[PDB]
Amino acid sequence: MKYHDYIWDLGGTLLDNYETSTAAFVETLALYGITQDHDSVYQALKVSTPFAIETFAPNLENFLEKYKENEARELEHPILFEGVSDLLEDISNQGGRHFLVSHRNDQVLEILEKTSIAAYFTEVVTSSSGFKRKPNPESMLYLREKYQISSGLVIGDRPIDIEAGQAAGLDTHLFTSIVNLRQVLDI
């Protein structure tokens, strides 16, 4: 068991936020009589919302407003990446601890409840903890000190996650899939 402590990222790592957003974006396009495929919309949103709108909905009246309403509805039932809860469990079964660092406010906590993974986290750091944003290592150094982390892995989907982890003296994993993370961990 290579690491004891796991410092997670939510969006793009545990939470498939682009899936719920894609569902909302595709359904909003349909209101205007427009069909676009899942994979194109998903990739466009991963670039940015302005890119997705300029690409697929540049002159659709009230599109953003309606899209955001549909997205909020989708997020009544957020979607984790496939296999997340089983991986969290396998790690916890070996005595591992899970932490979460987010730049978002305390809505994070609602998402963890709705997806039934709140029980996994020893501590969830949100913006209300007052720390600087990644890639600044402040929040991960706080966790390292408070929880006396000697064997920690920082998992996130973006460069800033890796940079924060490195600057905090922790090993990192650039998340692409749950299966691949399992392969790296032998678990």
- Residues of the shown chain interacting with Ca ion in the complex, contacts defined by CB under 5 A: 9, 11-12, 157
Q: Which is nearer to Ca ion, 14 or 149 (CB)?
A: 14
Tokens of 92: 């916890």
Tokens of 21: 């957003």
Closest approach of Ca ion to the CB of residue 135, in Å: 12
Residue showing the smallest CB distance to Ca ion in the complex: 12
Determine the Cα–Cα distance for residues 89 and 74; give it in Å rounded to an integer. 26
Closest approach of Ca ion to the CB of residue 164, in Å: 11
Closest approach of Ca ion to the CB of residue 58, in Å: 27
Closest approach of Ca ion to the CB of residue 10, in Å: 7
Three-state secondary structure of 16-47: CHHHHHHHHHHHHHHHCCCCCCHHHHHHHHHH
Q: Which is nearer to Ca ion, 9 or 138 (CB)?
A: 9
Q: Which is nearer to Ca ion, 12 or 83 (CB)?
A: 12
Task: Report the candidate in 14, 142, 24, 30 with the shortest Cα–Cα distance to residue 84.
Answer: 14
Q: Which is nearer to Ca ion, 104 or 114 (CB)?
A: 104
Q: Which is nearer to Ca ion, 12 or 135 (CB)?
A: 12
Closest approach of Ca ion to the CB of residue 156, in Å: 5
Query: Mapping DSSP to helix (H, G, I), strand (E, B) and coil, where does residue 99 land?
Result: strand
Query: Mapping DSSP to helix (H, G, I), strand (E, B) and coil, where does residue 14 land?
Result: coil
Determine the Cα–Cα distance for residues 177 and 186; give it in Å rounded to an integer. 14
Q: Which is nearer to Ca ion, 22 or 28 (CB)?
A: 22
Determine the Cα–Cα distance for residues 114 and 75; give it in Å rounded to an integer. 9
Closest approach of Ca ion to the CB of residue 109, in Å: 17
Task: Report the candidate in 118, 122, 129, 125 with the shortest Cα–Cα distance to residue 98.
Answer: 122
